[PDB]
Amino acid sequence: MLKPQQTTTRDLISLDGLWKFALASDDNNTQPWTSQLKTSLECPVPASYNDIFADSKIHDHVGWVYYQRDVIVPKGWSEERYLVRCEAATHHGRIYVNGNLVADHVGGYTPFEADITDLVAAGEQFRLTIAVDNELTYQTIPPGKVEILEATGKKVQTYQHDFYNYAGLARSVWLYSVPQQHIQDITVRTDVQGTTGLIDYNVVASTTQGTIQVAVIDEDGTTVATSSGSNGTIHIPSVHLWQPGAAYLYQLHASIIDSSKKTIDTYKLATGIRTVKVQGTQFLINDKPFYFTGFGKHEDTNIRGKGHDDAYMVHDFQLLHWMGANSFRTSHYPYAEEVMEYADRQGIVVIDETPAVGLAFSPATFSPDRINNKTREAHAQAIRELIHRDKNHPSVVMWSIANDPASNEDGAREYFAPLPKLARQLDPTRPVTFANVGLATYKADRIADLFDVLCLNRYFGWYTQTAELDEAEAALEEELRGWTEKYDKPIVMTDYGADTVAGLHSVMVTPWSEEFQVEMLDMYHRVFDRFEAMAGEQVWNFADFQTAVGVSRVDGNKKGVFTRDRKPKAAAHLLRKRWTNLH
Amino acid sequence: MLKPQQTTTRDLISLDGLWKFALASDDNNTQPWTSQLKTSLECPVPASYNDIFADSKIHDHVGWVYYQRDVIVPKGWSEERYLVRCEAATHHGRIYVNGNLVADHVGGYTPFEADITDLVAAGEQFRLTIAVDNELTYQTIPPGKVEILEATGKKVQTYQHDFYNYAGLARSVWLYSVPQQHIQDITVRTDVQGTTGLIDYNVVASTTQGTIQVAVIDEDGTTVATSSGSNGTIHIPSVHLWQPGAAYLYQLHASIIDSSKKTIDTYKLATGIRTVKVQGTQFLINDKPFYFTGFGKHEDTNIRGKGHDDAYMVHDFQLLHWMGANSFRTSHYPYAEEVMEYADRQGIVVIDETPAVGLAFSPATFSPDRINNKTREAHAQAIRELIHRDKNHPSVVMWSIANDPASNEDGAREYFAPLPKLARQLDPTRPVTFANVGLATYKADRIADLFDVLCLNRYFGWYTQTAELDEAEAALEEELRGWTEKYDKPIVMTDYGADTVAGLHSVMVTPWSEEFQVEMLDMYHRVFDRFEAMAGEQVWNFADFQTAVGVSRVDGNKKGVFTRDRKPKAAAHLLRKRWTNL
């Protein structure tokens, strides 16, 4: 259902705070959800659990963990319907109401919930256990594989993506209420015809006893259009368009109305009116060419891992404005909903991406014993959930289906083909892409024609023609010539950068130095400006972030333009110089 | 009123989130709370606003700021009373409901609230504006003075303390409900007769029609004792005590009961049965001698300033447990209430401290034109609000009235005298202290005898000009001798350490190196261990933190044993060695 909010007809209780916490063990205490959890450990809830406790065993845990607390259902919610929702459980979440299992959810970055109305009475207290598993298989969405170390028998988790596999309840948890007759979902699609905006709306409600009313109210509070019935099309004369650096949001009020025109339910949905179209080599927002600038990001901060953080979000956006970035990509999984809402308000453009990284074992990637049909089912599901949650965001401008898949290999085409079709059928208003890895050159890639925009990740400077920028430059523009020659589509570089340690400086060409980072980005830009077909540049990455451990990762990925704590490297100042002065 | 909770009779709504934010300005919008703020800025609400926006004007701003958002009172609060509460607005907060002022509060680190029951009806939406001011004066409890830079006209805030003057709503904001008859306060006081535990309670409730019941439930869910009446003494045979090693917490449920046997209001107060006592030079918890190990801390993290953060809190306590630290002090303001609850559960011991730092201009500090009796009122007020909120925490084992006052100057004894009497009077169950500065030597100080425990801050700087260890050692020992000859009280060292940059190393004796910090702590310990009267050692500081700009401050205070982002310097390992053993 829709993201809960408080209305005149709905109440909303945060369940954030400290919960009791335990790992699964191998004792008789199988089934921790059947009684009061016995632990001194408390884990804060919007957070990944891994780095919270300064304990290796928790950090390295493979398998299930348990969060628990008591909840009291407000006494005045008899006569109403009520749910427990996890905005996200990374990767597999189970909800229990006193020992009854009431939801079982497999994706790691989208919402799930359970209607507990008939299990617990208003004003009753219950024990809420939420079990979350972190295990990845070749069928989970980021896929991976658990192994056992021979000598010690320690379980270990392998996977093919960079960022660390933080787990837990990294986003907030809620108790909320709706009326018996309630709104469940709303879809809004926005076109523009001259100066007139139009909203195609569709409301889905638990009942059609009593009817649906809509009002559309502008930023000044004046009702600018009205409509009746669950589905319809509204015109808005002289619209204020939502624009890439000037957000404008109307506010769509969907209500359920009884025989007496008495409101029995209501929901307020923020709406930006704007259009995305791809025309040849151009990416058009409101019929005008747009050029992405900004980053691929990560949900990653010092202690709470991937947990949502209001402050770092608002700061992160301020830093985007400060350097004149107009966009980012939700690199390698959907971010928290609040980020998308905030982007809507900040006038920031978003490439919104599924959790589908790691579909590459370079052993044939797309085969029965690796990334097969059952993985595609999970991928299809990821696509549906992402789209079902983020479809109404004006800031969301395109769907990214995957990141660095092995789109050069046999089987890749048979695997991906249905997916861009599924997306476009779920949401026909946005174009679809994926992020292409170096191995799938314009010659070798077998999947690119099935997409509306091409996104490329490239590290010519760093990984291959190492510190040889003149060699990287030639190879970069060879590759881009190939792509422009072969496809009539917009090109966005979604990765390009260099690991860089704050304070490490050199007047020579030296990788891992701030000078090198600047020089490489600056070369890439020179090359970008040589190609009419370029529609965007998003540096990798906004900020240093944590990775699986490895002799080649210096306490994480240090390709950030800011440090993990958001201090700017020289690179940051270079981008600021370029993005505040370019078109 | 008591820290609000959700019960069967009470509802609690978090108002944290992003709020509209504006700086005050000198335009005809002289009153932003009378209408929707159309600013595009949004500030997150458990946070200080200063480093959040990446904006100078906002960071350096002196004066009021406005937070704003709409709220809806739930439909079902009809028969109910409801309030808006700020846990804290630093330093001066105002709450507005649609153009109307309904609360005005002055301290920066304790809660305030307003009964809005009669202004807004159940199911109504209203505009909530909260004004927060950051100006310090000579009468604000951390005192200060606003000044004008002559060449630029720029407004600037002076003060005498280290930590940066972060402001805003650094703590959570709430809408909550309470029945017409409700409990408003509870005092518990715990003591021991043999193996039987004693709980004196007093419950203050809005009306006396229909009685009060108390149940005391143990960690297994067993009701272990009951009582009737608004106040009384409950006996807990074979009590499990709250100990520094090992928290045990009973759960006391105070209720109001109607004519029938029907619960009208209820409230769940965690209580740990424990005594604190000073005897000669010994600090006793449950009759056995106690030695404080741990830190002076601060509420300081990278972006959110002093904003409370559950993650950093849990981690910071794991690091304490990791290095075997058993205590910390709330230098230099009461910390979030949730930290004190968490301290109760973690078995960690707390010296709880007021905002009264910076009462020192080293011109005469204690005089009619400086820190005066009007200031003393704010100070008394600060003691009152702190003790009222933290009185029931078993973790809180001592009140610290001030940090680094000029306790050596004329006027200082006459200013301070009322204050420890006031504290002991509002809480007779704990001892009172203050953290003494290096100027106020055993000779010079004229306040110390008025307190129950002596806490010394003795950075080596007080003792040596050129970072010479043997020089520092001789002077620290001389001074500690003075204190132990002249007072029969426990001594706790509450500040010692060295500015230290992570990664700066030297095989020599070099200040600002990880080695120097190690050697200095270690030398201090050797000196402390020579003195029986020592009851404690808390290093300054737990972690690196932000300060006002000073060419002597390297983007803040680097005396942390951890970095701002909680990485250990060598000193952390050295402390871990000492505290995990003896």
Ligand SMILES: CC1(C)[C@@H](O[C@H]2O[C@H](C(=O)O)[C@@H](O)[C@H](O)[C@H]2O)CC[C@]2(C)[C@H]3C(=O)C=C4[C@@H]5C[C@@](C)(C(=O)O)CC[C@]5(C)CC[C@@]4(C)[C@]3(C)CC[C@@H]12
């Ligand atoms: C690592 C990935 C998957 C790709 O994404 C990465 O982004 C960031 C990073 O690189 O640091 C991090 O977020 C994280 O590490 C990853 O998600 C970046 C590109 C990537 C490293 C590829 C290459 O850079 C180049 C490769 C070449 C291709 C080719 C044709 C050649 O240049 O000659 C063959 C040799 C080689 C090394 C084969 C591997 C890839 C395709 C490589 C290393 C794969 C992984 C990519």
